Structure formats: structure tokens, C-alpha cells
Symmetry: C3
Subunit: 409 residues, 3 copies
Amino acid sequence: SREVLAEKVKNAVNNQPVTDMHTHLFSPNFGEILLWDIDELLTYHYLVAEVMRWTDVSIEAFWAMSKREQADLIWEELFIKRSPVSEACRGVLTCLQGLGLDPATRDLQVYREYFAKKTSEEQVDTVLQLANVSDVVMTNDPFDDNERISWLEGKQPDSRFHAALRLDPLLNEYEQTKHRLRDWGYKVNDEWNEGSIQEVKRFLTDWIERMDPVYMAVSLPPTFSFPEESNRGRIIRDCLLPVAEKHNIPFAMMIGVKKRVHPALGDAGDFVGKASMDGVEHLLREYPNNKFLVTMLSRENQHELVVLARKFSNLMIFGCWWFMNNPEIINEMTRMRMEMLGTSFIPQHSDARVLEQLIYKWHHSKSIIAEVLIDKYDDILQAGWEVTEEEIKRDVADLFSRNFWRFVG
Amino acid sequence: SREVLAEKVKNAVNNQPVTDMHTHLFSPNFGEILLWDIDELLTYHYLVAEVMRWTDVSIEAFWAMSKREQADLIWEELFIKRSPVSEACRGVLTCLQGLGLDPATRDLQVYREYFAKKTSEEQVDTVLQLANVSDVVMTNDPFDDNERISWLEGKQPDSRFHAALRLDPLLNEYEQTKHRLRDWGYKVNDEWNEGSIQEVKRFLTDWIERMDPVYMAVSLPPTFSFPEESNRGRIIRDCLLPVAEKHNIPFAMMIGVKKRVHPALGDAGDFVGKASMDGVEHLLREYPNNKFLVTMLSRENQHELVVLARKFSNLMIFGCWWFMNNPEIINEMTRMRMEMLGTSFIPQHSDARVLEQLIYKWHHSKSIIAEVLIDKYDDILQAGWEVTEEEIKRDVADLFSRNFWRFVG
Amino acid sequence: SREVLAEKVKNAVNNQPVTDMHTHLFSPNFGEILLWDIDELLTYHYLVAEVMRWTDVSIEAFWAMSKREQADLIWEELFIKRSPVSEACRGVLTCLQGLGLDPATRDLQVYREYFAKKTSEEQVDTVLQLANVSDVVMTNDPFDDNERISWLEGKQPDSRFHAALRLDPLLNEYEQTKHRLRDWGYKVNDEWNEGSIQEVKRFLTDWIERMDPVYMAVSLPPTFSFPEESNRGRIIRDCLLPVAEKHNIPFAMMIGVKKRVHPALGDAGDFVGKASMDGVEHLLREYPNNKFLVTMLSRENQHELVVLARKFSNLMIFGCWWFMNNPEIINEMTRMRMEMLGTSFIPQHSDARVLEQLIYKWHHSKSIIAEVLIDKYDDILQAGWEVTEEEIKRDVADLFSRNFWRFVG
Ligand SMILES: O=C(O)[C@@H](O)[C@H](O)[C@H](O)C(=O)NO
Ligand SMILES: O=C(O)[C@@H](O)[C@H](O)[C@H](O)C(=O)NO
Ligand SMILES: O=C(O)[C@@H](O)[C@H](O)[C@H](O)C(=O)NO
Ligand SMILES: [Cl-]
Ligand SMILES: [Zn+2]
Ligand SMILES: [Zn+2]
Ligand SMILES: [Zn+2]
Ligand SMILES: [Zn+2]
């Protein structure tokens, strides 16, 4: 009867349309910022870091190569010279097979043919159908010249794509960012006074109006603290929180990233650190009318984060972020979470940078989540409880989609 | 032959009478402080925290409801609207089934009937028989007005119940507690001098004489330190340790709890934090004639605690406490412990607040411990070693009962 | 087809000759420092710590017993009075069975007979053949009077044994060690100046020339930091690194050991602590022309160490050291590592102190690594990838031998 349960859980999980609440994808009409195709998959920064542990090619020479050459190098170094057993390499193969291509031939030239004959709009339809993803939440940074243009030009995203206002430059680099704000018309002063406060709010409000984001977000360092008499502390306290409450918009904090420990690696140069929970605890307790979405980078912060979620209902924890996005960790995190929170959390997000990743990110995660659900349902079944297929579909819907939409309101 | 071993290990584990060395239960003759019945199980604070993550009912409104209404709300929110897959919810079902009730009907009114027709004394006999628990260690706090009365009135606990002198108010709130001591006749001065020292010892000795506790205990914060020029540091050094050595009574320290991070939740408002091992290390090494029972709340303290037990024989680690009491964690902790300590530790305690919890707490934990034992016995069996059924029963007896009684002496 | 894969992975793993890159063994011709036989196995410090948690025999009385008596005590306490389920006890049995002895008889006197009729050279041939170990890396400390003699007398180690220059006394006890250096002719001054710098380099160079080590090593405390204006910080910066770069010799750092928390236990008296990654991060980034071999003692440092390896190619992480060398931990560590690094790491080393341990250390670890490999190969097989037996043998060769030799150059 566990196998009967297993088949129903797996079916429910596989058929449930997914709302990916955090990615780095863009509506196809936004242009080239939407990365896709086998060359992009292979040049994903997760693989750049991995190839540099093997190749004799210098990092400078690598960045000088064309994307085709980088992709050929990574394919040779990580798939041919050594078996592609890492999670990221495994992911590439899963994407290929899911698209109908054959990893058995190891024919990179043939795989490339598949992508060259399609348009971005077509590949988006293909991938979302294969990955069974109904909604994608973008990461939209108004401080990026390329992204900003699209929004200013009035471009509205595809109905399947949702905006999220990323604020890293504002919160973590205010000393430099303030000057850009001034150039844009927001009259922030040198001192943090009523004027600076109101203009920063104006800036946030203008972009909220323009993007209609499901939430505002920021990635924070292991040393994150709050309250704090710093630009970040003051902006969060005097501008972000008040504005988020007014529009009832959740604040997402991705905590634990130590930026650029290896600058030459670019996007692959970030490290991780354990953070104190004090700041998050204070925010949750002192701002009960604000909603917070949180995910942490350190493996050592995971359990206490689950416990904090038991304390505050205005906290919704989500995903297995970045360095946590590996089977061994996803499994332990998801089990600890269901054990202490039942179904009141968002188990995963893809964080996809390349369109096709939605296939492997969700395929790999769904199989793990399905196994966890099967164990948990079986435990209560052995206790005499009877679970209906509709209750399973309901639970699965909450985990992969409803909890998020319900939280953002 | 692994299945032959499995059946013997499981049989031995299930038939071994358990000594629960830490609970919040009371001898039935102590009165109403002994909580029991389906309504109490459902209003366990672990479930209050969980229901607050789902219900639209305010925490104030919840505390205003009758226990019957709270129980109905929790049943509806956590068992009916979503599958009861969390560890605490699973536990309720296990208790129901163990009592002969049927979770399949989901008939809360029928379950309530079972409890209304029995006396506390009868339910105690029923539960201890079902849970196969021979001895229960209570948590007796002389600073609680309700508990204190029973002891002062000369009430002696049931032979199956043992006393443990809880000292949180004395050690963590001396500034306020000192005044109560004075009102009780213990002449502690404003300054920590010979007089204050002797009167605190007198207080401890009087209660040791009155309760005849198996150990003195205290829960400590993540910031716990020792030695320390504070009330706690001085009381432990000048009073607790000397008195514990004289009567050869162990000192139990439950470390890592951060009290009231969410006051409105009451008992469900405590958080957790990783502690430094420095204080425990110092205590173990500098007080070789004292015995220490230790359990920690942070997942990140578990492995180093096991290593410290390898260093000092006056340290006996026990259980998977509170936020650690979940399958995923219990499994990892128990395996790390057996691997580095063999059978020289106490794997679990229930921490039961409601009588019936003894059923699920021990049922859930025993099945995990049995699987760990089976793996470990199988590994040495494959090495050519032959384990007899009597040796298995012996090992199981040490884990679930003898190690504790042997340690407390 | 998973079983077909399983048989090939297991075969490849078992047949792959192992290069043990860190042990405390010595070439047989070096003399008595090479410990071997059943009495040594039983008196391994891991077991001394374990027996002290059970026996009523004082630690002083234990150290006063002959090695035969200590071995009899440990056998009685840990194998007869309680089942030998701990990892270290399990290891002893694995060694016995591997040598052809029968753990079923529990006849210690008979086992002893096997060893008394052989020479060290013969047992070395026997063990290395059984453990399938082709190369052993020793730990050679020039500050030890016993070891130093052999080297000064011109003794060259067996071709299967390689030297590693251990520098703990120099780096962690310079204030005392400096005086010994002077007595040996190295004119280090009271102040850290050009003269002291050059003489410390001379000392390192002389021993590098004499030992021809594959790397220089040191064990460091949880509080390790760098850069640092201390003897250790200055010696590493001004002498060790420059010299290691010139001879292209890797620097091995075993971090997280807190020495002598329980002095009376001798070698069994060391504890563990979580370290900051700051020092390692700085060393890797600021000294790109230097190579670093790193292993950490704290379970809480493992994941971030893997992430740091993704950042820097001059970092090669290795093994599951000491308190990490237990199935539960080895399994989680190895899976996290393969998931984020593929095959670019050294999964294990034995750290053997007694010759026969090579049998169980490698037997226990190989079975775990084999299971991890099987899961990872199966995941990509399910993705459509086809792995050849030769590619498996290749991958296995990198993990157990080639990655190390390639890194040391
Ligand atoms: O949102 C973030 O800051 C991260 O997720 C980064 O995009 C990171 O580099 C990444 O690729 N995802 O994990
Ligand atoms: O003894 C303690 O301090 C804890 O166990 C508390 O009673 C806690 O609230 C609880 O219910 N048990 O984990
Ligand atoms: O090399 C080291 O410092 C350690 O490995 C010690 O030798 C330790 O005591 C041991 O036996 N190995 O883990
Ligand atoms: Cl930690
Ligand atoms: Zn695990
Ligand atoms: Zn992201
Ligand atoms: Zn308790
Ligand atoms: Zn070693």
C-alpha cells in the first residue's frame, strides 16, 4: 500500500503546475536578457567554477573565448575527461533528455542544431510545458541599465512572468547609488533626513507602480544586522518597511552571501557565511504588519530558520538556495521543514539563469520532494489515518504554488 | 540474516521497559497538574505554534477560547484543511491508534468519549502499559506556587514517578528570586557573601531532602558561560556544585533555549541558539567529582557535544531535545552518537507535557533507534562477530534504562 | 541496470590501488615507531577514550598497566561487556577478519599468536596487499627526538612510504621551539628580523632536502587566523609560503583541533571547534602560486569548505578527518562534495596510527564511497548518459590516487 501511495504522490507532484517564485529569467519580449540554448546552459557560472578546478586554461583566457569555445571547453573538461556526476552537470543532461535530445551520443554539435532553429518565444512555450511551470517570478533590478530600458520603454512582461523589485544597489551600496538617484531626479541629501527619506520612498513607489512586483527583494551578507545605524538599516527602517506595509508587499531577504571573494570569477566568485538570526527575529517581531520571505545560504542556518518560522506567522521560508540546492541538502532541509512546519512553507524555487534549467531544477527537486511526501504520508497512514487523492493534490498545490500566492496576497 | 537480526532487535527494543528521564508529567495524586486527554494533546504548545501559521484567528482570540474550542480549531486547521504530516500532528494520531481509537473516522467527538469515562489514575495505568514505560522522571519546580503546595502538604509521588529539582528561577532570575527566598526564610543578603552562600545551600538542601530528586536541573541560554562573575555563575560555583557533590546528585543542563522571542505565544514562544562549549568543557574538567547530564537545543552543537563526551566520563549526554526531536534529526544524532560512543549514552527522553504523548514519543523514537541498532549490529556481524539475543537485550536495557540509573547512582 | 552499475562500481573501487595521503605510519626500516599487532589496535587512543566512559579503572592505573593488560581491559569493557558497535571497535573486528582471524571465537589469545610469529616487514607486505594500498604518506616531525634520529642517520624510507614535513612545534610553539632551533645551529634572533626569517627558511630547506616531502603540514586551532601579527602568522607569511612556492610544495592545513582539553587522556585528550574561513580564504586568494591541501575537524565547517573549493583551484580538500571519520558523517560529506565538485577532491585518508588499521579504514570508507558513486552514476544514467567501465575506473583512480599526485605535482 506504500507503492499505491507512492504512485499517487508522484502523479500529483508531477502534474501540479509550478509557480517558480524566484528566478533570473525574463519575459521573452524583454529581449536578449532571456538566456537560453545549450551554450548558455554549459556556460552557467556554476559550471565555470567547476571547470576552473580542472582546466589548465587561465581564467583570463576563458573570459576571452567566445561562448561557443567556452561551452566546448566545459563540455570536454567536465563531461568527457571526467564523468558529469556533479549536480550542475547532471542538470545539463536532464535538460537535454527532457527536450528530446540524446545524451547517449554526446554529440554537442547535434544538440546545438535543435536550438538554432527556434525563436525565444517558441522555446519558452516548450520549456514551460515540459517543466510544467505556470508562473515565473523574475528578478528585476531598476539599477541595471539594460533592464531599466525595457521598463522605461513601457514594455509589459508576458502574463506568465511576474516582476520582483530587486534592491541590492540601494540597500548595500547607498553611498554610490545615492548619486545615481540624484541624477534620476530623486533629491536625496547628504544627511539622512526627512527629505532623503521621502525621496527614497518616492523611488520605491515609482517602481512599484511601474513593475507591480509581487515582492521587493535583496541579498544580504552573513554579517547582516538589524536594527542598525547604517544606510541599509535606516533605509529598511524608514523607507522599505513603511512602503511595503502600505502596499501590502512582502519583503524577501536572501541572507548569507559574501560577495566577490574571487573577483576574477565574476558571478562564480561569491562565497557563503553563517548569519546571526537576531536581525530577522527583530524584524519579524517588531513589524507584525509586514510580511517576510526568507531563504538563507548557510547550511548551519537552516534548522534555526525553521524554528523561527514556528514562532512567526509573518515569515514564509522558501527554497534551497544556491549552495543549498544539492540533493543531500535539499533532502535534509525539506524533511526538517515538513517535520516542524507541516505544509506551511515553500520547498523550492529554481533560481534559473538560463531558460532550459527550469527542466532539471524542477525535475530534480520534485523527485526529492515526492519521496519526502511519501514518507510523511506513509507515517500517518501507518497511524491509521486515511489520505484521499484529492487531499494529496491539495497539499501538493499548497507547496508548489498556493502558499506563495496566498502569502503575497 | 539481517532480517533475523532485525526481528530480534525490534523485539528487544519494543519489550524493553523504558525509564523516561525527563518529562513534564506528574504523579496522578498530585492533582490537575497532570494533563491528559485528547483536548490536551491537541492544545500542546507545539501545535499552537503550527496552527498560528495557518489560522486567521488572532493569538488573543485563541487564548480566549475554551480548551474545547482551541482543540476544535487545531483539529480543523491542521488535520482537516491540510494533511497532518508534521511530527507533532503525526504524534496525536499515533496516540489515538495506540489507545484503540480509530484515526480513520476523524471523529473527534467519539475520541473525546473515551477519555471522559476514565480517571487520571486509570489513564496513567493504561498509558504506561501501552508505552511500556516503567519509570517517569518529573520536572519539579519549587518556585511554582501550584507545585510547591503539593510538596509542602507532604504529598509523596507514585512509586513510578521520580522527582527532579528544576532551578531556572534561582539560577536565571536570582535578582527577582532572592526576594522570594527571603520571604521563605532564607536570609540571602544583597551582596554575595558567606551568608548568602549558606542560605542558598540551605534552600537546595531542604528541597533535596523533601523531594529526594534523581538530579537538579536548569535550562540555559545560547550565551551560557562558565566561570562567570554573575548570579548564575556564583550560585553554580559556590552552592550548586558543592551541594551536588556532597549528595552525589547529578547536575542536568539543557542548553540553547532563548526564552520568549514571541511572548504572545506563551510556552510556544521560545527560540534556539548555538552555544559555546567552553562553559561545559570547564565544568567537566574542573569538577571531576561532579556528574553532569547534558542535552543541547542547537543542531549545530550536537556533534561537538558527542566529542566532548569522548573526553569526559563525568558527562552523560541524553535525548533529542525539543526542536531536535524530529525523525531527520533524531536519526542523524543517534547514529553520530553510537558511532563515537557505542552504547555509553541515553538516546532519548519524551519531555511529555500531556500523559498520552508517552505513546507516540516512545513509539516514534524506538522505531528509529531500532533501525540504527540493526545497522550497527549488522556491520559487526558482517565483520564476523556473533551477537546473542541476550547481548542485544542487555545493550537495549543500557540505552533505555540502565545507563541513566547507573549514572545517577 | 542499477545492479549492473553497482557491480562495476564496487569492482572498480575495490581493485583501485590506494594512495593514503595522510597517516601516522612509518617505513618498517624506521624501527619500532611503526606500530602493529592486535595489542596496538586495541590500545589505539580512540578506544582509550571509549573505555574510560565505562571502566572503573582510573586513568592513572590504566597508563600504569602493561600494553597487554590495557588491551585485555579494553577488550573486556568494549567487546565483551557491551557489543562492539562503535566505529573504532567495529574497525578492530574488520582488521581481524581481513587477516583471516575469526571474530566469532572472541579468542584474543589466539589472535595474538598470529602477530607474534611475523616480522614488521612481513606484516607490512600483508596489510598493504589486503588493504590494496600502493602508497602511504607518513607524518614526519623533525622536532621529535625519536624520528629525527632516523633521518640524521641517513635512513631512507621504503619506496612505498613518502615523507611529509609536519611543523606544529615550529608554527604553534615558536616561543619554545626557537631555543631548540638555536641549539641546532639556526641563528634565529629574539626579534623577528631578516636574520630570523632567513634561518627559519634554512631550517625548512634543510629538512625539505633531507626528507623530500610531498607537502609540509600543520594542525591548527579553531581560532586560526591569517594574516596575523603572531609567530605563526609571521612564519607562515615570511618563511613557509615563500619556501613552498620555490620548491612547488603544497601546504597542508588540518584545522579545528583544540589541544589537551583533558591532558590526562594524552593523545585521546583533544577536542574540536568550528573555525572561521577568513584565514583560509585570504591564503587561497592572496597566494595564487601556492597550493593548499585542507581538511577541517568541525562538522559545521564542512559545507562552507566545499564552497570555498569551488572558488579556488589552488585548494584541494581531502578526507573525513578524525571526529569526522564516522559513517554518518563520511556519507554526508562525500555526497555534498561530489555534488558541488564532481570528482575534483580527495574523499579520504586513513590517518592510521597502527599498521593494520589500513584494512578497516579503507574497507569502511570504500563501501561508503562506492554507494555514493553508484547513486551519482545512476542519476546521469537515468538522464540518458552512458558511462563506460573504463570511465568508471578512471574516475575511481582520480579519487583514490591521481588527484593527489597530480596536485602535489
Ligand atoms: O539572487 C541572487 O542573488 C543569487 O541567486 C544569484 O543570482 C546567484 O549567482 C545564482 O546564480 N543563483 O543562485
Ligand atoms: O524543560 C524545558 O525547559 C523544555 O523541555 C520545555 O518544557 C519545552 O517548552 C517543552 O515543551 N519541551 O521540549
Ligand atoms: O594529524 C593529526 O594531528 C591528527 O590526525 C592526530 O594524529 C590524531 O590524534 C589522530 O589519531 N588522528 O585523527
Ligand atoms: Cl555553526
Ligand atoms: Zn543526513
Ligand atoms: Zn537568485
Ligand atoms: Zn522539558
Ligand atoms: Zn593525522
